[PDB]
Amino acid sequence: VAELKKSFNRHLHFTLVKDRNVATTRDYYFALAHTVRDHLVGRWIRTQQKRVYYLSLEFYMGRTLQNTMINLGLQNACDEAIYQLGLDIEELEEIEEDAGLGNGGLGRLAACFLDSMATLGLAAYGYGIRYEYGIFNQKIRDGWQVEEADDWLRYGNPWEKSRPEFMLPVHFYGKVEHTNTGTKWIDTQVVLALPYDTPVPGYMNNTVNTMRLWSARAPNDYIQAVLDRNLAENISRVLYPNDNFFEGKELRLKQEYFVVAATLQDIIRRFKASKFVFDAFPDQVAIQLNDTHPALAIPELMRIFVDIEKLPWSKAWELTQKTFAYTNHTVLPEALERWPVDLVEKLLPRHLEIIYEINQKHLDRIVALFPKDVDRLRRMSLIEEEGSKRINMAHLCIVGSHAVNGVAKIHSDIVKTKVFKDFSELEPDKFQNKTNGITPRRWLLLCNPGLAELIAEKIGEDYVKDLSQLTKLHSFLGDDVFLRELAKVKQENKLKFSQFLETEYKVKINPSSMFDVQVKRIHEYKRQLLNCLHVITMYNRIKKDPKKLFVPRTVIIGGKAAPGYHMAKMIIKLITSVADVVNNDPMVGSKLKVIFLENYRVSLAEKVIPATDLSEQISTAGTEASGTGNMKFMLNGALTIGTMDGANVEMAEEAGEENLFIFGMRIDDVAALDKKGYEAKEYYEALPELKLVIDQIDNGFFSPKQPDLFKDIINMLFYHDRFKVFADYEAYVKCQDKVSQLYMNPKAWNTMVLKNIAASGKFSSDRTIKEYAQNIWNVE
Amino acid sequence: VAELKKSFNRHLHFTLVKDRNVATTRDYYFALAHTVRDHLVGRWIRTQQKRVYYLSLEFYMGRTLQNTMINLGLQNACDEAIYQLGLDIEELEEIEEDAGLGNGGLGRLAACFLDSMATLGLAAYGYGIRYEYGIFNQKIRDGWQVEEADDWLRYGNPWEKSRPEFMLPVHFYGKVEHTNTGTKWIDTQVVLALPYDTPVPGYMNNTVNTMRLWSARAPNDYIQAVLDRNLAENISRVLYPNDNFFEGKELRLKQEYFVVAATLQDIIRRFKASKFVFDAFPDQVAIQLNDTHPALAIPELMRIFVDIEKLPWSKAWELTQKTFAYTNHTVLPEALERWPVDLVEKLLPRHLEIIYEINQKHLDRIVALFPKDVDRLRRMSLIEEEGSKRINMAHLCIVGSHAVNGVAKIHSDIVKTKVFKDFSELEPDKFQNKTNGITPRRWLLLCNPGLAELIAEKIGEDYVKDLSQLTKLHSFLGDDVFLRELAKVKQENKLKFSQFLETEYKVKINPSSMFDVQVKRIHEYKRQLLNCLHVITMYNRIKKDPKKLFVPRTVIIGGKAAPGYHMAKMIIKLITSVADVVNNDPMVGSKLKVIFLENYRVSLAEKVIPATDLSEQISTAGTEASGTGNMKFMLNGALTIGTMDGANVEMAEEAGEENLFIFGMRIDDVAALDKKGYEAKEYYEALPELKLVIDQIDNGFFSPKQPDLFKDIINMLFYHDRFKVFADYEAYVKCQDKVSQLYMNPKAWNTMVLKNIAASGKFSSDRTIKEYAQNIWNVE
Ligand SMILES: *Cc1c(COP(=O)(O)O)cnc(C)c1O
Ligand SMILES: *Cc1c(COP(=O)(O)O)cnc(C)c1O
């Protein structure tokens, strides 16, 4: 403890240039971060000197100090030293800005994968773009959504480390010149790529992997010419905000090309400097593509093999196929990347030529087998020419990889059988399944220390490594003291989150109330509108007769929206209006409060997840591939309600469908409704409560100033409904009534909570990473 | 020594994240810089907790590590430790990038002033803009000038330190609102100002002052909106390249306003947090304005006193006058700032109103004394309305300060008597004289260690503090061994610089040759064209008859030009053409070489100054205010030739006019020639050598490809000559012949060198800072 205090004081003195009489809390935080980095740096150095290379455009890391101290096993001594110094740890932690470099589940899964590979001892690297601005910081002004820039690097970064040695040139634009010896790509602008190294420690395993982020620079080759160096740096400037939607901008194509080029050149440099010549490259380099975003890594690797290395074309394509593995995350038609040919030709002419060459070879190979198939010729191509010609990047990832994945069992089946039937039937073993997972360290040990300690008191500490040990908690279903203590830790977390909520939102929180939380990105397919309709329903139920007993229920809905997405903004406005009406009704009192959680992120989830009682995953069945939020909920002692979709099917299989509240129509029923013809007015006319709620929304009950504030939402619900909000309202209300009736009995509620806890060990990210290593990457 | 090795190794381990088997030389340099910063940080902290506040737009610092180790007195132990590690110190030093934040003499004088205030123990601060790009890096391509961006911060900065605590808001644009209580300036854009602290150690005195640089940021209040945050950061981006010329851009006005606003608010914050209420402000804050660049500090201080503090107008103006002191650096009519009223009104409406108010009060005060003077009413105003109305910022600095200065005795006399006669006769004691100086530490102890050690062996080490002890070297004029050893150290420095030159320029350097150097910014008034004409003259002299004896003379001319200044670029082209012709003549051999020094800066001057034999300061008399280059030359054992101008008059007074080679027409003779009517053709027709040189230039002798390459230079020399190049050629040639004849005798040359060395103690910056403190700032 004395050594850590001396190190902290020395870092305050020399590194910060400060004394105890002037240092702010930010300086103390920086000193603590520097001393924990000094604690990890020796093993980081030792680890730096087959390998996996994970290539994502997003890494939703969050906050580092607490996770690093948990993974290093230095919490007791550090907390004791901070106490003896005379400081609090909560404000020091709150000083740190989150690395909000991911939009949502994809980047969060990438970060969990990095933590799992570090914990399992694998030799892996992370690769991405060092965005100076994350998603954004969200604030509610006049009940609306306003976005402000997220400057997470203004005050410094005590974790990353620039590497001047490994700066690489990335070329843009130009022309193709044909010569006898190779193909020449010339007249190109050069953009520099500067790497920054962020450690990724493993839990108690002496392994510190690396997260390398590429920072754009300018070549040094007049004032306006100096002010135009920002255009080269305009890539790596700001993370794009779309969660699933695909824009099609010339920017973010430069970002994709920049990251894939820099990463491929860095790995090739690392391989050439090894003892290993390119016939062993697929045996030493496995490149995992998170989504269709790093799809240009296939033609770029082809360009390096065929032009810079002048390898034979056939061998180069063989090595590229043996090196790449593909993972699919979305199925939504508007969520699929299709870059127009003209934009790529302007930006990447050599890559467009390589894409045409790969397409021609693949089409000839397919037409050899199927002389009769003419429509298959158009279907299986890498180019779509219905209007303007566009490049199906998913097809390019398919043909260029030796594996293809889905994020869930249902999603894997859909992509293999429905989405990519033509590719799958020819290559049956290529298409596989890997169900997502969440790291126990960040989401149980860091997120919920009380529940983690309670579990460790029963089944030991071995569950951290392998989450499947949670099944040993089934032996404690008979005991009642354990259920009481479980409810007690839930109530303690609820009290802490209520302390947060009261100060932050100026609303009094009933502490015995059920915490009903729905945190996710605001999408139409995620159906926050159904939750809004339900809260208006139970508000009207309270208004009808206050004599009847009601369940004390706190409703929390928090998530960001795309800045250009109007309907999500309208849904946020409706949530804020309903919260304003319901919170300020004397008749309701402490029966129904609606809080719109603000600036939802990893750090905020580390506080709202361990206090949740009911989880809302009510997306339309067949529209969600897989979400990791419900896994965190199920891990942190929360009962889940929702549809049979995404990871909900796996959770219902693992714990039992009777231990979850499953409502709504299934995928087959959704398809049957689509075939029959969906009309929302018929559902509207046949329900009194739903009709009352919709009429109140339309009649300006929540918008006294503008009578037509929610006409957009009303028209979307009635005449252009796409995700069947009305067709699931009846089942949603019935299951919410069942939830309320079950909450009245602590015994049954705690029994189902224990059943969900003991059956969530499957959804660890260690399991997913082991499947990835032993079935795709072929490492260890 | 062992402690320093351990500290270096520990900094390599933790700070750099590197091991000895992979670390480059850059990492070793960073470790050394970090350990010397750790050596200074304790006294920096102790010093941080009346004061002088020096406000410059330029700080031409150069390289820090060597200067810091010299001022800290830690050279022997550091060199021994670096040797025992197994490294060289020269490449580690060459790793560091110069802080080229100054265009020329002004920023260099500012840096010397900071070093002198630190050395003298004063409580002073530096204030300026943290430019990400300096002047530029200069390279010669095809004999022409090309500019590349100077990215001195790409790989880090082991000296500065950001201060998040002292971020301040700077407001731009807006409108003026008139109310009963004060004046309101509203509808303004906010630009953040983030300070960075760079230490300024004093020589062996336990005083480490601060250099605070303001970095522009953006307020956090959509992709394009994120890409437009660079416009706010476009100030503090790049240093403007003009040396004396005034552009008149909307940018660099935002820079001036930004720096003055941030500095004034910071100092006011520091004063309010002290034990001292505003009646004591002039007794505790002295703000020195380097040039007319921070002229807006007067109306901004008035705005803070009258609006933010609501002090009475009369008291506020009193305090502002008692706080400010002005220093003049230039006299050239095109070098004087005159901001148009419309641009300031668009940018600073409240400041324009304050400027009008000050102007009205001053004009009323003057017209009270002089009812008859009508032309004086127009002359003494702060506004000139010949065409578009412009603000004479020099007048504003005059009226708003309690002192006014010139950089030389002649310059002070000119500004008091000729430039500002009306202001000076009313306020006789306000106008003063302070002659510039150079710090001995950087320019003798760091620049020329051999000469410094030789001097210390004779008159002790006390000369470092007070340079006036150099007069004790007059007792060694009789001895011949001392003169021989002086020539020996000159030859050693010459050998080192020849080792540099041979590798850098692919030219063989005669080591017994005289080093003829002219390093300064390429200006017409600095007359590098006269030197080019002289070198062509002696080349033709060699060509005429190689039998005649010639002096081995190496001619070096190096300096940067303004990117928009065409004539300087043409002069550089002419120098390169003449160098190409002369260097590649077999007849000349080792008699005449011309090297155009590349990328001239502080670090390069630390190598070329201590090897110089003859100094070229041949600016037209009356056009140069004062230069500090000739002071460095005279300090480092070099004989000076030139005109009676700038500091040359003071040097001739201090050492003796017979100990300098003074030629050309004086200021009175220049004025007489101007009155008579200057015609260059008459001088052209009456000289055979000059006519031959000019004909060769015009006849394409140096430009075989383009016969008319130098027609611009020829027309400027003949029909639009402004600085009388031809009228001084005769005297220049005669004095160069005298120099060559004197160089043949080592005894006379060494006698004059010793005389110049012993009479340069006046030009220390300690003398200038003492005069500033005891006559203007009233500190200590
Ligand atoms: C778990 C996680 C998510 C995942 O959201 P889903 O909609 O379930 O995919 C999003 N944000 C944060 C901060 C998370 O921790
Ligand atoms: C001394 C110094 C100057 C001063 O130049 P002058 O023309 O004499 O004013 C310029 N550059 C550097 C690097 C210097 O050290």
mmCIF file of N, CA, C and O and ligand atoms in Angstrom, chain B residues 60 103-106 108 243 438 442-443 519-521 525-526 600-606 609 617 624 626-633, ligand 2:
data_model
loop_
_atom_site.group_PDB
_atom_site.id
_atom_site.type_symbol
_atom_site.label_atom_id
_atom_site.label_comp_id
_atom_site.label_asym_id
_atom_site.label_seq_id
_atom_site.Cartn_x
_atom_site.Cartn_y
_atom_site.Cartn_z
ATOM 1 N N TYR B 60 10.716 32.377 -30.834
ATOM 2 C CA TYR B 60 11.620 31.590 -31.671
ATOM 3 C C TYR B 60 12.618 30.863 -30.766
ATOM 4 O O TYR B 60 13.800 31.197 -30.677
ATOM 5 N N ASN B 103 9.336 34.235 -36.781
ATOM 6 C CA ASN B 103 9.781 34.457 -38.153
ATOM 7 C C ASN B 103 11.254 34.845 -38.206
ATOM 8 O O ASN B 103 11.956 34.507 -39.164
ATOM 9 N N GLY B 104 11.739 35.556 -37.190
ATOM 10 C CA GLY B 104 13.051 36.166 -37.269
ATOM 11 C C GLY B 104 13.549 36.779 -35.977
ATOM 12 O O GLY B 104 13.494 36.150 -34.917
ATOM 13 N N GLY B 105 14.061 38.009 -36.069
ATOM 14 C CA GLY B 105 14.703 38.633 -34.922
ATOM 15 C C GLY B 105 13.761 38.903 -33.763
ATOM 16 O O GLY B 105 14.174 38.882 -32.604
ATOM 17 N N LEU B 106 12.491 39.188 -34.057
ATOM 18 C CA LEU B 106 11.546 39.547 -33.000
ATOM 19 C C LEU B 106 11.318 38.384 -32.035
ATOM 20 O O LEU B 106 11.468 38.534 -30.815
ATOM 21 N N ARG B 108 13.164 35.708 -31.710
ATOM 22 C CA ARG B 108 14.444 35.357 -31.107
ATOM 23 C C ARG B 108 14.760 36.269 -29.928
ATOM 24 O O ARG B 108 15.228 35.808 -28.879
ATOM 25 N N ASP B 243 7.875 38.402 -42.336
ATOM 26 C CA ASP B 243 8.860 38.824 -41.345
ATOM 27 C C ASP B 243 8.578 40.242 -40.861
ATOM 28 O O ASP B 243 8.388 40.478 -39.664
ATOM 29 N N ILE B 438 21.568 39.690 -26.725
ATOM 30 C CA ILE B 438 21.490 38.251 -26.945
ATOM 31 C C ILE B 438 21.972 37.541 -25.690
ATOM 32 O O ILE B 438 22.901 38.006 -25.021
ATOM 33 N N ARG B 442 22.894 30.712 -24.602
ATOM 34 C CA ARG B 442 22.565 30.011 -25.838
ATOM 35 C C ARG B 442 23.585 30.289 -26.934
ATOM 36 O O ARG B 442 23.876 29.412 -27.755
ATOM 37 N N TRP B 443 24.137 31.500 -26.970
ATOM 38 C CA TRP B 443 24.916 31.955 -28.112
ATOM 39 C C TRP B 443 26.414 32.009 -27.846
ATOM 40 O O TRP B 443 27.181 32.291 -28.771
ATOM 41 N N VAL B 519 23.698 35.073 -43.043
ATOM 42 C CA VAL B 519 22.473 34.369 -42.680
ATOM 43 C C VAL B 519 21.475 35.383 -42.131
ATOM 44 O O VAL B 519 21.717 36.023 -41.100
ATOM 45 N N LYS B 520 20.359 35.541 -42.837
ATOM 46 C CA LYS B 520 19.237 36.367 -42.404
ATOM 47 C C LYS B 520 18.092 36.127 -43.375
ATOM 48 O O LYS B 520 18.264 35.490 -44.418
ATOM 49 N N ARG B 521 16.918 36.642 -43.022
ATOM 50 C CA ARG B 521 15.760 36.510 -43.893
ATOM 51 C C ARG B 521 15.997 37.247 -45.205
ATOM 52 O O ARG B 521 16.549 38.349 -45.228
ATOM 53 N N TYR B 525 15.892 44.938 -48.570
ATOM 54 C CA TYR B 525 16.642 45.895 -47.768
ATOM 55 C C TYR B 525 17.851 45.261 -47.099
ATOM 56 O O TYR B 525 18.777 45.984 -46.718
ATOM 57 N N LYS B 526 17.873 43.937 -46.960
ATOM 58 C CA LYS B 526 19.028 43.255 -46.393
ATOM 59 C C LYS B 526 20.135 43.025 -47.412
ATOM 60 O O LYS B 526 21.260 42.701 -47.017
ATOM 61 N N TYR B 600 17.592 27.619 -42.520
ATOM 62 C CA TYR B 600 18.315 28.353 -41.491
ATOM 63 C C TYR B 600 17.416 28.575 -40.279
ATOM 64 O O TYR B 600 16.270 29.012 -40.415
ATOM 65 N N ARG B 601 17.935 28.267 -39.095
ATOM 66 C CA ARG B 601 17.139 28.305 -37.874
ATOM 67 C C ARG B 601 18.085 28.434 -36.684
ATOM 68 O O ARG B 601 19.292 28.636 -36.850
ATOM 69 N N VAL B 602 17.531 28.321 -35.475
ATOM 70 C CA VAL B 602 18.337 28.487 -34.267
ATOM 71 C C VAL B 602 19.366 27.371 -34.145
ATOM 72 O O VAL B 602 20.534 27.619 -33.819
ATOM 73 N N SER B 603 18.953 26.126 -34.390
ATOM 74 C CA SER B 603 19.883 25.007 -34.283
ATOM 75 C C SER B 603 20.988 25.103 -35.327
ATOM 76 O O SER B 603 22.155 24.828 -35.028
ATOM 77 N N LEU B 604 20.638 25.481 -36.558
ATOM 78 C CA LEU B 604 21.649 25.647 -37.595
ATOM 79 C C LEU B 604 22.574 26.815 -37.278
ATOM 80 O O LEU B 604 23.784 26.746 -37.534
ATOM 81 N N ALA B 605 22.022 27.900 -36.730
ATOM 82 C CA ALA B 605 22.850 29.026 -36.317
ATOM 83 C C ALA B 605 23.788 28.643 -35.182
ATOM 84 O O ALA B 605 24.893 29.182 -35.087
ATOM 85 N N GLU B 606 23.390 27.699 -34.333
ATOM 86 C CA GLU B 606 24.291 27.249 -33.283
ATOM 87 C C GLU B 606 25.526 26.551 -33.837
ATOM 88 O O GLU B 606 26.484 26.335 -33.088
ATOM 89 N N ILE B 609 27.295 29.980 -36.742
ATOM 90 C CA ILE B 609 27.845 31.175 -36.092
ATOM 91 C C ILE B 609 29.237 30.939 -35.515
ATOM 92 O O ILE B 609 30.132 31.764 -35.764
ATOM 93 N N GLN B 617 26.543 42.190 -42.809
ATOM 94 C CA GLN B 617 25.373 42.988 -42.441
ATOM 95 C C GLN B 617 25.426 44.254 -43.284
ATOM 96 O O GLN B 617 25.871 45.304 -42.824
ATOM 97 N N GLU B 624 17.361 49.429 -41.445
ATOM 98 C CA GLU B 624 17.334 48.377 -40.439
ATOM 99 C C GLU B 624 17.298 49.022 -39.062
ATOM 100 O O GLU B 624 18.142 49.867 -38.746
ATOM 101 N N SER B 626 17.358 47.313 -35.824
ATOM 102 C CA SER B 626 18.415 46.646 -35.078
ATOM 103 C C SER B 626 18.320 45.143 -35.298
ATOM 104 O O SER B 626 17.228 44.570 -35.238
ATOM 105 N N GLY B 627 19.448 44.500 -35.556
ATOM 106 C CA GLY B 627 19.497 43.055 -35.720
ATOM 107 C C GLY B 627 20.379 42.438 -34.653
ATOM 108 O O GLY B 627 21.388 43.024 -34.261
ATOM 109 N N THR B 628 19.981 41.263 -34.173
ATOM 110 C CA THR B 628 20.757 40.553 -33.166
ATOM 111 C C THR B 628 21.706 39.520 -33.758
ATOM 112 O O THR B 628 22.482 38.919 -33.008
ATOM 113 N N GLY B 629 21.664 39.300 -35.074
ATOM 114 C CA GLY B 629 22.593 38.364 -35.687
ATOM 115 C C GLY B 629 24.033 38.838 -35.613
ATOM 116 O O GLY B 629 24.940 38.065 -35.292
ATOM 117 N N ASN B 630 24.258 40.120 -35.908
ATOM 118 C CA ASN B 630 25.611 40.664 -35.854
ATOM 119 C C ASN B 630 26.165 40.647 -34.438
ATOM 120 O O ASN B 630 27.380 40.529 -34.251
ATOM 121 N N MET B 631 25.296 40.755 -33.430
ATOM 122 C CA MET B 631 25.747 40.598 -32.051
ATOM 123 C C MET B 631 26.274 39.191 -31.802
ATOM 124 O O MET B 631 27.313 39.014 -31.154
ATOM 125 N N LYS B 632 25.567 38.174 -32.306
ATOM 126 C CA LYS B 632 26.041 36.800 -32.167
ATOM 127 C C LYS B 632 27.355 36.597 -32.905
ATOM 128 O O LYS B 632 28.265 35.931 -32.400
ATOM 129 N N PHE B 633 27.463 37.152 -34.114
ATOM 130 C CA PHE B 633 28.713 37.077 -34.860
ATOM 131 C C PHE B 633 29.864 37.687 -34.070
ATOM 132 O O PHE B 633 30.899 37.043 -33.862
HETATM 133 C C1 LIG C 2 19.941 35.666 -34.256
HETATM 134 C C2 LIG C 2 18.837 34.989 -34.999
HETATM 135 C C3 LIG C 2 18.185 35.670 -36.017
HETATM 136 C C4 LIG C 2 18.239 37.176 -36.065
HETATM 137 O O1 LIG C 2 18.285 37.621 -37.405
HETATM 138 P P1 LIG C 2 18.533 39.174 -37.752
HETATM 139 O O2 LIG C 2 18.352 39.413 -39.227
HETATM 140 O O3 LIG C 2 19.940 39.544 -37.357
HETATM 141 O O4 LIG C 2 17.545 40.019 -36.987
HETATM 142 C C5 LIG C 2 17.473 34.971 -36.982
HETATM 143 N N1 LIG C 2 17.421 33.593 -36.943
HETATM 144 C C6 LIG C 2 18.069 32.913 -35.938
HETATM 145 C C7 LIG C 2 18.016 31.419 -35.891
HETATM 146 C C8 LIG C 2 18.777 33.606 -34.970
HETATM 147 O O5 LIG C 2 19.421 32.924 -33.980
#
